[PDB]
Design an enzyme around this catalytic site. Structure first.
Site, PDB file in Angstrom:
ATOM      1  N   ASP A 126      -6.116   8.753  -0.123  1.00 44.99           N
ATOM      2  CA  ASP A 126      -5.626   7.726   0.796  1.00 44.99           C
ATOM      3  C   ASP A 126      -4.375   8.187   1.538  1.00 44.99           C
ATOM      4  O   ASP A 126      -3.466   8.759   0.932  1.00 44.99           O
ATOM      5  CB  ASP A 126      -5.295   6.420   0.062  1.00 44.99           C
ATOM      6  N   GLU A 152       0.826  -1.215   0.000  1.00 43.96           N
ATOM      7  CA  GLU A 152       0.000   0.000   0.000  1.00 43.96           C
ATOM      8  C   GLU A 152       0.865   1.272   0.000  1.00 43.96           C
ATOM      9  O   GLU A 152       0.519   2.259  -0.653  1.00 43.96           O
ATOM     10  CB  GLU A 152      -0.950   0.013   1.200  1.00 43.96           C
ATOM     11  N   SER A 181     -11.499  11.662  -3.306  1.00 42.15           N
ATOM     12  CA  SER A 181     -11.001  11.319  -1.981  1.00 42.15           C
ATOM     13  C   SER A 181      -9.493  11.062  -2.057  1.00 42.15           C
ATOM     14  O   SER A 181      -8.917  11.022  -3.140  1.00 42.15           O
ATOM     15  CB  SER A 181     -11.729  10.094  -1.416  1.00 42.15           C
TER      16      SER A 181
END
Ligand SMILES: [Cl-]
Ligand code: NA
Length: 129
Positions: A52, A35, A50
């Site tokens: 992360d 990630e 959005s």
């Protein structure tokens, strides 16, 4: 902060993630690797606008407030910037809430695609825990 593999394993373990909701430590280290490359300062933007945040790439659409995702929720009740700290406590407390919401670790796309069904124990091999 860019964590080392075994450094992050130990930090996670201390924070209660080993076997949390049935997910062994190797799963969490694998997810974090793919990630964010173990970098607490990682950010990425999504198509819906959005963003992360952090070592586990938690999404401002549902989980944190960044003041620029209109109509989103803040279910971990924190500023998204708190997820970028070198102290991973906030990222871990929020991840525990995510993984508990019914869908387990499938919430993390890189986990589903790159860790799930693999030998995740290899991610903590060699580490002093
Ligand atoms: Cl599960
Ligand atoms: Na939000």
């Amino acid at each position: 902060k860019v964590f080392g593999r075994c450094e992050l394993a130990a930090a996670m373990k201390r924070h209660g993630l080993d076997n949390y909701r049935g997910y062994s430590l190797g799963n969490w280290v694998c997810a974090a690797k793919f990630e964010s490359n173990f970098n607490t300062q990682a950010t990425n933007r999504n198509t819906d606008g959005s963003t992360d945040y952090g070592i586990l790439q938690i999404n401002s659409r549902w989980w944190c407030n960044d003041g620029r995702t209109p109509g989103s929720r803040n279910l971990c009740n924190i500023p998204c910037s708190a997820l970028l700290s070198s102290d991973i406590t906030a990222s871990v407390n929020c991840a525990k809430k995510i993984v508990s919401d019914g869908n387990g670790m499938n919430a993390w796309v890189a986990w589903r695609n790159r860790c799930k069904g693999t030998d995740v124990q290899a991610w903590i091999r060699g580490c002093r825990l």
